[PDB]
Ligand binder design. Structure first.
Ligand code: ATP
Ligand code: MG
Lengths: 430, 310, 376
């Protein structure tokens, strides 16, 4: 009956609001068929009464004692879907005064959950600039807080993925500086929170071309590209990153790298320090154990091979030289293509190759140690046969031999075990 | 002149289906010393054959039909039956022995014996103990494969199998492998609980279940500090086999299957190789030693005494 | 949802109501949400158990008025939830003390299981994998022996109860029906074939071990002869709420268990009962549908039950302990016939250690040392 008319009237709002709240306040231990109907009715009520809803409605709908916050803990996915739909409908209102109340309540709950998680690890509190009074003293379990944080982030994606909301803490600023604590220690124990935050930020940034055109609304987004590059470069230099997060970072970095070369009007953007940090992170992601990560980094460096300072090209030359000898054929071809894109004035200059120097240090460290006496006669026979006659009689056999010659009861970096030069030198020495 | 000995394309049976020794593996052994023997133990469908194949001479990119240790077929799981029977033997080009055994306390084996001294249940229970004791006395490392964490009944079986061994007592290393691990099992909070439960469930086992094969040092958990764990037991996790924004893959919360398998294979190849007996044995001598051990285990006294108690 | 002990002490709105008791037990993996709670939540269609909410055994109860079915849940050491607590307590606070501790826990679980089989109509067994565990064959055989021995005490406890005539003689409402529930765990219509194969395997194994006989009166439990009693739970996205939330977030940025249980509950709720016998000469089976107060009158008396402690101490870690004691006793004569005196004592101790060992080696070693020292 309510859906027949259009939101252009002045029907009794108190009657419907009271009717809906009465059923919502007594729908805890109810069947699945009744909760869905109650939530659908609430969504329809919020959508029908556009800009005419008092602050009391949204205020009572997002408090710790509200029944809506406890209805999202259902097991069936259908109940969670309608529960999220209610949040989406409330966050899709055009009335700024009432939208801020719900926004602050959601941020307060998020801060409370984050504080509980931080306290669980014996760490000080944080995010005191978005705290709310309604959650002054509330205790959330690890599983409960971890669940509400992700649920709230997903709910915020409603406004984060909008195509045009002037709130105090903007979505971009919130996810880029307010929730920066999730990358220090919360990432090691709860990587899902970091992944959700990064995914939401990436989804919101990709819809506006990563705010590259601005580098009323244009003047407000005149410094988001630099922040994005700085965040990517800072997070990529970390040597204790998660496998899932690193892949997302590589995809985002490659997309940004390709986008910076789409037009010539972005030429003056290659002189900002953020670009230097981004390039350093890209270089640091190479020579890792993951083949796909190395391929992504190589592709990103090749896309923007030119317009790069000589200081970075010189570093890329050493990386290419080291990757020329790899067990996998894809890495060799990709790095060879990248090396062929560097001018001869840099490839043949007399600067030192630091990656080549690490290899020497590893070989020296292994030679300086005492003999292990683990090289068996069969291994020697195979190695000598491959040199004197050309037949190894073994069907990546060098890595297997190296691993079989080690003993766990009784020092070369693991990322260097994929280089054929190191393996051959070690085998000859043995 | 310095040609290689030979190569194996498939595994061979070391023990017949009727618990009979098979003397057919001596044709692939040499007079070389410092050999490494690896064993496996697990339930009916934990995945012992697949793990042994991927650790000896197979890769995940291959097909299950080329595995050196035959795995279960799609039609076999429909009937609730086992695939591997007896004890299998296989040696790689690196001179490493791999042994694959039949499931312990298998319902399929018992059912098969039904359609054929007191009750078959006791016989099936004694066979598992005999195999476990033989592996414990002739292998350097024994891997235990489990589908779910903490059966609570496998630890008792492992401890009782050790108490009925044939005969400075030698104790091999033990590795706890959790197969088909999920995302919730790769969290530090649950990892600590798993380690604590393992340490408390085998406080008086005498087996070398701790000290080596630490997945924390294999970069599985990049930022986890070593002090987070009170005691690190030999535990490893194996999960289920498997513009630019729209192509992002789903979140799994754990490393790839191939990466973990490679890490486990790399660590198993570096296991210690202590002395089994008070004599330096070669590849050919170990065969005779194992044959004598099997013969003595079959006609033993401790096993008979334990059997008479049921 | 309250504890069984906290429910028998205390009803008027539903005192006279025909109810059917259903028990739940089995092993559960170390998961955030136990599989037993999910079963009750799905059968009742409501969130009965909310999410994020010396003796390591517990019995819970719950009554559903819409279905007139009483649910009883059992949690013990077999569940990783209690085992984690036990290990945590053992970590903070001897090879012989731990053995006794585990044995005591096993005995408590056995007693609870024995009590559950006397006050239930239908029992469900859950397992984290599709493979059938054969240890249950021995567990059931050990339970039947204890049940057939403490029968006089159990019957005398409820002697003065309005349960009925057959109930007072058999100390149970009727022969309970056992149901099995397995988890796919990524395995694999194929489900129907697997269910039939599992049913046949379980029936054959239990029949050979004499657990199931032709007469449904002597057996501890019965299984349907024409209906299905094995259910396989397929995988779903319900578990691991974090993963489901992540999937939903990603999408935003761009028969049944109830029927399987009702087919058996309807028979009890319709006074028909369970008739299962294939010995070519079936005998009548007792059956009685009680009320809330009538059932509580017997449940309270059975829960409070003096000689059970002594009768349960004859019944597993007992075999291991006996084997270890026998081995130690046999090895002691060799060491006692082997031996200033420090060298002889050390040699005897080494010989004894290399001869035999087990879970009771400290006692034998101390006795041998004392005997050797008292002879010099
Ligand atoms: N981690 C895994 N991911 C996917 N499939 C797996 C995994 N582990 C095992 N499987 C599958 O489950 C089955 C396991 O049976 P498999 O033959 O590997 O060994 P098994 O069950 O230990 O042996 P047996 O039945 O002889 O005792 C196979 O079909 C295998 O493909
Ligand atoms: Mg097998």
């Amino acid at each position: 009956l309510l859906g027949s008319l259009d939101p252009s009237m002045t029907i009794h709002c108190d009657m419907v609001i009271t009717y809906g709240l009465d059923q919502l306040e007594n729908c805890q231990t109810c069947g699945t068929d009744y909760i869905i109907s109650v939530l659908n009715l609430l969504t329809l009520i919020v959508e029908q009464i556009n800009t005419k809803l008092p602050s009391s409605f949204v205020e009572k709908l997002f408090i710790p004692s509200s029944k809506l916050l406890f209805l999202r803990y259902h097991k069936e996915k259908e109940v969670v879907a309608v529960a999220h739909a209610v949040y989406q409908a409330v966050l899709s209102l055009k009335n700024i005064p009432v939208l801020e109340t719900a926004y602050k309540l959601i941020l307060g709950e998020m801060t409370c959950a984050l504080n509980n998680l931080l306290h669980s690890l014996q760490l000080p509190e944080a995010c005191s600039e978005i705290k709310h009074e309604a959650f002054k003293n509330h205790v959330f379990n690890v599983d409960n807080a971890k669940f509400v944080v992700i649920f709230d982030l997903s709910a915020l994606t409603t406004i984060g993925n909008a195509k045009n909301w002037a709130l105090s803490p903007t979505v971009f600023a919130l996810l880029s500086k307010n929730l920066m604590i999730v990358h220090s220690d919360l990432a090691v124990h709860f990587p899902a929170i970091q992944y959700a935050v990064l995914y939401t930020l990436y989804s919101h940034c990709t819809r506006h071309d990563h705010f590259i055109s601005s580098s009323t609304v244009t003047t407000a987004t005149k410094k988001h590209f630099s922040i994005i590059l700085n965040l990517l470069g800072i997070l990529l230099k970390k040597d204790n990153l998660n496998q899932d997060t690193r892949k997302l970072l590589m995809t985002w970095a490659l997309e940004a790298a390709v986008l910076m070369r789409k037009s010539e009007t972005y030429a003056p953007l290659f002189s900002l320090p953020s670009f230097h940090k981004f390039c350093k992170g890209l270089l640091a992601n190479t020579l890792v154990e993951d083949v796909n990560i190395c391929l992504q980094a190589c592709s990103s460096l090749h896309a923007l091979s030119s317009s790069l300072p000589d200081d970075l090209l010189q570093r890329c030359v050493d990386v290419c030289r080291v990757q020329l000898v790899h067990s996998g054929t894809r890495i060799r071809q990709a790095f060879g293509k990248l090396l062929k894109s560097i001018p001869l004035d840099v490839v043949l200059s007399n600067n030192n190759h630091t990656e080549i120097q690490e290899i020497s240090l590893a070989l020296r460290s292994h030679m300086s140690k005492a003999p292990s006496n683990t090289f068996h006669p069969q291994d020697f026979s195979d190695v000598i046969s491959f040199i004197l006659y050309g037949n190894s009689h073994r069907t990546n056999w060098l890595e297997r031999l190296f691993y079989s010659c080690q003993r766990l009861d009784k020092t070369i970096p693991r990322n260097l075990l994929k280089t054929d030069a190191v393996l051959w030198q070690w085998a000859i020495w043995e | 002149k310095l040609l290689p000995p030979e190569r194996m394309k498939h595994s061979i049976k070391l023990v017949d289906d009727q618990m009979n020794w098979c003397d057919s593996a001596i044709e692939y052994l040499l007079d070389q010393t410092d050999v490494l023997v690896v064993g496996v133990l697990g339930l009916q469908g934990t995945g012992k054959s697949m793990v042994m194949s991927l650790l000896s001479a197979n890769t995940p990119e291959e097909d299950q039909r080329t595995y050196v240790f035959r795995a279960q077929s799609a039609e076999m799981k429909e009937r609730g039956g086992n695939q591997t029977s007896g004890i299998d033997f296989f040696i790689t080009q690196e001179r490493i022995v791999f042994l694959d055994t039949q499931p312990i306390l298998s319902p399929s084996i018992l059912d098969h014996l039904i359609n054929n001294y007191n009750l078959p249940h006791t016989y099936v229970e004694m066979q598992s103990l005999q195999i476990a004791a033989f592996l414990f006395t002739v292998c350097h490392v024994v891997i235990v494969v489990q589908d779910w964490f903490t059966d609570l009944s496998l630890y008792r079986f492992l401890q009782t199998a050790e108490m009925v061994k044939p005969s400075t007592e030698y104790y091999p290393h033990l590795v706890f492998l959790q197969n088909k691990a999920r995302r919730e099992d790769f969290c530090p909070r649950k990892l600590r609980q798993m380690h604590l439960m393992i340490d408390q469930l085998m406080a008086h086992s005498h087996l070398r279940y701790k000290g080596t094969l630490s997945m924390l040092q294999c970069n599985v958990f990049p930022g986890l500090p070593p002090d987070f764990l009170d005691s690190e037991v030999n535990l490893f996790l194996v999960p289920f086999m498997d513009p630019l924004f729209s192509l992002l893959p789903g979140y799994r919360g754990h490393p790839s299957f191939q990466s973990l398998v490679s890490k486990l294979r790399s660590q198993v190849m570096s296991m210690a190789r202590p002395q089994l007996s008070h004599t330096i044995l070669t590849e050919k001598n170990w065969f005779h030693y194992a044959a004598r051990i099997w013969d003595g285990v079959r006609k033993s006294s401790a096993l008979a005494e334990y059997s008479r108690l049921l | 949802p309250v504890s069984l002990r906290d429910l028998l002490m205390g009803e008027p709105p539903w005192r006279e109501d025909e109810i059917c008791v259903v028990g739940i037990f089995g092993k559960t993996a170390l998961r955030l949400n136990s599989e037993k709670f999910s079963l009750v939540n799905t059968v009742c269609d409501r969130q009965v158990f909310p999410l994020f909410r010396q003796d390591y055994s517990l019995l819970q109860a719950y009554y559903s008025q819409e279905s007139k079915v009483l649910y009883l849940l059992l949690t013990s050491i077999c569940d990783n939830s209690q085992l984690l607590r036990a290990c945590r307590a053992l970590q903070s606070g001897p090879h012989a003390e731990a053995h006794e501790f585990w044995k005591h826990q096993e005995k408590l679980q056995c007693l609870s299981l024995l009590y559950l089989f006397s006050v239930c109509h239908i029992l469900l067994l859950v397992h984290p994998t599709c493979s059938f565990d054969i240890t249950y064959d021995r567990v059931f055989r050990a339970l039947d022996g204890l049940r057939q021995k403490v029968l006089p005490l159990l019957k005398t406890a409820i002697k003065d109860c309005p349960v009925g005539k057959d109930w007072k003689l058999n100390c149970r409402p009727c022969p309970p029906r056992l149901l099995f529930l397995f988890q796919l765990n990524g395995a694999l219509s194929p489900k129907r074939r697997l269910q039939h194969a599992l049913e046949d395997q379980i029936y054959r194994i239990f029949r050979k071990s004499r657990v199931l006989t032709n007469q449904s009166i002597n057996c501890l439990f019965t299984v349907p002869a024409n209906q299905a009693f094995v259910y396989i739970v397929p995988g779903s996205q319900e578990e691991d709420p974090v993963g489901m939330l992540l999937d939903q977030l990603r999408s935003h940025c761009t028969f049944t268990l109830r029927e399987f249980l009702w087919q058996h509950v309807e028979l009890v709720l319709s006074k028909k009962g369970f008739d299962d016998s294939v010995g070519r000469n079936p005998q009548p089976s007792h059956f009685e549908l009680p009320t809330y107060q009538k059932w509580i009158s017997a449940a309270s008396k059975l829960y409070e039950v003096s000689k059970i402690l002594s009768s349960i101490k004859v019944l597993f870690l007992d075999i291991d302990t006996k084997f270890s004691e026998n081995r130690c006793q046999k090895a002691l004569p060799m060491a006692h016939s082997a031996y200033v005196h420090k060298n002889q004592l050390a040699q005897a101790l080494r010989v004894y250690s290399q001869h035999a060992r087990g879970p009771a080696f400290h006692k034998y070693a101390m006795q041998l040392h004392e005997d050797c020292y008292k002879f010099w």
